[PDB]
Amino acid sequence: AASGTQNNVLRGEPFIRGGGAGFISGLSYLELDNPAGNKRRYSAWAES
Amino acid sequence: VTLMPIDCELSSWSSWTTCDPCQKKRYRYAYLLQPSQFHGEPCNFSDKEVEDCVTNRPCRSQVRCEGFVCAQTGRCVNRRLLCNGDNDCGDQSDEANCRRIYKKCQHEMDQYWGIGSLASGINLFTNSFEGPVLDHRYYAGGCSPHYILNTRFRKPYNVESYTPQTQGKYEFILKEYESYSDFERNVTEKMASKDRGKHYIRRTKRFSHTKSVFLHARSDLEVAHYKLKPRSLMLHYEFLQRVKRLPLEYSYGEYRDLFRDFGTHYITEAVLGGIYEYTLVMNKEAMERGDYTLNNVHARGILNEIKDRNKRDTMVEDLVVLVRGGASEHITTLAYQELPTADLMQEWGDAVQYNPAIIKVKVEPLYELVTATDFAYSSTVRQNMKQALEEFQKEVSSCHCAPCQGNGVPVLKGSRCDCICPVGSQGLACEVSYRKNTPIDGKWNCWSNWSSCSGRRKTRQRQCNNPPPQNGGSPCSGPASETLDCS
Amino acid sequence: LAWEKGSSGLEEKTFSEWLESVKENPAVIDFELAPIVDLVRNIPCAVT
């Protein structure tokens, strides 16, 4: 007799105030491969 | 499909009101008693009947235009607006015969985007803009320089603030569940003698697998905030002219048409946005059975052997995307089935700046527009309009509509109820699906109108509507019974 | 530069691009103070 089980959850929740409307939706688009933010998009948000 | 369609019914007519002293007409109306649904025949008749009159009661309809009468529209405009180089009357009347014109705006100045769209009142029950109530092309002098990015804008006189208020949210979830099982059970037995022998075998497998993947990603982008002034408002002339056509006598049908033409409430504060909701929902299953047996005897001899082997695999997957602000090239590529590459998302949000939807909004009942500086016998028109507004809410609220199959949602536009169908079910009632069952979300019947005065009660039931059939969701959003003072 | 996780120590490419940007908009890092009330000379009743 054999039994096996798995579970996974991910939640991620970027929130932004200030920024240009497009740069905001750029930065806040969550990267599974880089959950903090793509550095160029983040720098562009920090410009906008 | 399990249907026999419901054709429309309006009521038998009211008695006539007596003739109005100022409108010189009389009116009769019917309640909508049962909406058109399942493509049952409409009976709309534009919901009204009206006739002329010969009565001679006194009328005080001459509320003075103090400034200048806009000859076509019947608006009045204050005298500093004549020859301001702008159309304050609607039909350019104010700028006739200008011995000089004086300009004010030193530069070209865009309207803030959607500011003329916000100018229209909502039917709060379909959640729809119906038609134009405040003149968002009126500038009262104005020409104060406002900026968003490097673009420059003109603010309508009616609006307190339009400002970017530039805020954004993203919320993401991914979930997986998996479960596996495998069982194998066997038997073997033997005998021999010197002559005879015997043998027996069983082998077995039972197996199962399951997965879900669920993903939801929502973004809300809020890159303008609108607030309308509290009062001192300047009305759109098409609204103003149905208001000047309302009876001072009470007969609900003429007041009903104002809510149809101009909405139930006017939009007073709104956050103006784009939304990009994405959901991907997956359920996956697999199963197997394998079974194998033998029996043998020897003395002469005999053999029996059997195999039974089985497999199933399935996926059900649903995806929904909603996007509510931007420009059509971005909007379609976001609307594509794939999770949007952040360049798209950038160019979409950049266009939300130029074409928002309303995200969240606070609204005031339209009778607060009706005012003594704008209409004769105004306070009677208000009291009438308040009563009609309550009766209209009882008509437009969806509760009359028979329940959709497949957890469909009714919105009751015009005088027809049409069931909006989710992903995975189709047809007029949303019946047609490959699926076994769907969870149902609850809503009440129409509420009982009132009990007596000296403490008054309203009551609601869910008899067909209820969640328990096929294991539904929430039954409720408010109080299953309701009571108040009479005064 | 603020985005840099720092596990490497300073990434001179980012630190220099930031430092060039600091030339373009500084912040007060240390300061030498005199009391506000010594300043005023224009106003009527200045001394009072």
Ligand SMILES: *[C@@H]1O[C@H](CO)[C@@H](O)[C@H](O)[C@@H]1O
């Ligand atoms: C008003 O409505 C009833 C219901 O059809 C009709 O018999 C007739 O139009 C009445 O005046």
Ligand SMILES: *[C@@H]1O[C@H](CO)[C@@H](O)[C@H](O)[C@@H]1O
């Ligand atoms: C009947 O009465 C209330 C009015 O306060 C409605 O809002 C509701 O539909 C209830 O059932």
Ligand SMILES: [Ca+2]
């Ligand atoms: Ca003018």
